[PDB]
Amino acid sequence: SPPLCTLPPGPEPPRFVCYCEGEEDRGGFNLYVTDAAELWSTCFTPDSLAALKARFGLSAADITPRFRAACEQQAVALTLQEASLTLSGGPSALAFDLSKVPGPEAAPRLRALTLGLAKRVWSLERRLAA
Amino acid sequence: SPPLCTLPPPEPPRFVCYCEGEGFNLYVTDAAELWSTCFTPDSLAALKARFGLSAADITPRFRAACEQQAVALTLQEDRASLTLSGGPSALAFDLSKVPGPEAAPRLRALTLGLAKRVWSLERRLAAA
């Protein structure tokens, strides 16, 4: 269950999805945001992630649990200009710079994201019969 | 002209963000309750540490994000956060709720001050 959430909150139609990967054969960590046209990412490097785990609480030894938190808790603000993402679930507030992922990389990610979500919905409702 | 802005960005305004002055704080209010950074010299220095170049102003960068409609805000539970999305990196500020007795004179002064500023601005725009 990789965490995610949509925006805006509540009734209205969803305009953005925020999600992340991956801490686990483990990948480095990133947040993603898409309007299902374009895709923005933290595009972290080891140093830049470390320097953000600097500016706030954590040791370099996961952020997933805290993003999972703000998702579960609908606690995510977002702002784009020619982007930034804020997690307000937890004790301190975290701010993330996000930049555009180039098309050739973004397209396959979006495609895979769509198919994956479809599989997850099927599987979730099967596990709702329980 | 101490910078400020209101959100949400033509719908009716529901919050005002502002700051003073340079000890420095950011403030946010719905004109009923008031949230603040509640800085001390050390805590502000330490935030100008955690990011931010030299500990030697933030006003210009808050002024920036105001002018540029670039301010996100989240409230809950006598806790809030304010995010400036102007510059090299996005800045986040934890704000806590100011108790009523401490907030009232600040809200009172804010209101009167804004009134005086509107009068004197239109005087200086009656110019052109």
Numbering used by the authors:
A (entry chain B): 5 to 28, 33 to 69, 71 to 91, 94 to 141
B (entry chain A): 5 to 13, 15 to 27, 36 to 69, 71 to 142
The authors write:
Non-homologous end joining (NHEJ) is a major pathway for detection and repair of DSBs in mammalian cells. Here we perform systematic interactome analyses of human NHEJ factors and identify a novel XRCC4-like protein named paralogue of XRCC4 and XLF (PAXX). The crystal structure study reveals that PAXX forms a homodimer through its N-terminal domain that is structurally similar to XRCC4 and XLF. Thus, our data reveal that PAXX is a new core NHEJ factor that plays a key role in the organization of NHEJ complexes for the repair of diverse types of DSB ends.
Immunoblotting of the Ku80-associated complex further validated this finding. Seven β-strands (S1–S7) and three helixes (H1–H3) were observed in the PAXX 1–145 structure, in which a globular head domain and a coiled-coil stalk formed a dimer, consistent with the observation that PAXX 1–145 exists primarily as a dimer in solution. As predicted, the N-terminal domain of PAXX was highly similar to those of XLF and XRCC4. Compared with XLF, PAXX showed more structural similarities to XRCC4. In XRCC4 and PAXX, the angle between the head domain and H3 is only ~45° due to a lack of tension. Structurally, the N-terminal domain of PAXX is more similar to that of XRCC4, as both exhibit a 45° angle between the head domain and the helix stalk. In addition, compared with XRCC4 and XLF, PAXX has a much shorter coiled-coil stalk.
